[PDB]
Amino acid sequence: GPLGSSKEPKSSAQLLEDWGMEDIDHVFSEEDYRTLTNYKAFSQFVRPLIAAKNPKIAVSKMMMVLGAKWREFSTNNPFKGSSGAS
């Protein structure tokens, strides 16, 4: 049978949950997609955000969450091209 050992990856929520931590119940919405168009703009927002729910988290773990969230963001983001095309 088709198992697919790599189909469902660990999302940032998954990772954080796997560590026994809670994530920000925020949802990257349409306006967020159009404004956080790059990782630096993204991290500057999302880092203090997640840190607000887990301030005692390890930075090494946090960077995984941020990175995964950027991925998740880009995944649910319909706007492939922030200003039209990309």
UniProtKB/Swiss-Prot annotation:
Protein name in UniProt: Chromodomain-helicase-DNA-binding protein 4
Extra facts: One of the main antigens reacting with anti-MI-2 positive sera of dermatomyositis.
Glycyl lysine isopeptide (Lys-Gly) (interchain with G-Cter in SUMO2) crosslink site(s): K7, K40
Family: Belongs to the SNF2/RAD54 helicase family.
Full-protein interval shown: 145 to 225 of 1912
Quaternary assembly: Component of the nucleosome remodeling and deacetylase (NuRD) repressor complex, composed of core proteins MTA1, MTA2, MTA3, RBBP4, RBBP7, HDAC1, HDAC2, MBD2, MBD3, and peripherally associated proteins CDK2AP1, CDK2AP2, GATAD2A, GATAD2B, CHD3, CHD4 and CHD5. The exact stoichiometry of the NuRD complex is unknown, and some subunits such as MBD2 and MBD3, GATAD2A and GATAD2B, and CHD3, CHD4 and CHD5 define mutually exclusive NuRD complexes. Interacts with IKFZ1; the interaction is direct and when in part of the NuRD complex. Part of a complex containing ATR and HDAC2.
Disease link: Sifrim-Hitz-Weiss syndrome: An autosomal dominant syndrome characterized by intellectual disability, variable congenital defects affecting cardiac, skeletal, and urogenital systems. Short stature, macrocephaly, hearing impairment, and facial dysmorphism are present in some patients.
Domain notes: The KIKL motif recognizes and binds the NET domain of BRD3.
Tissue occurrence: Widely expressed.
Subcellular location: Nucleus; Cytoplasm, Cytoskeleton, Microtubule organizing center, Centrosome
Role according to the record: ATP-dependent chromatin-remodeling factor that binds and distorts nucleosomal DNA. Acts as a component of the histone deacetylase NuRD complex which participates in the remodeling of chromatin. Localizes to acetylated damaged chromatin in a ZMYND8-dependent manner, to promote transcriptional repression and double-strand break repair by homologous recombination. Involved in neurogenesis.
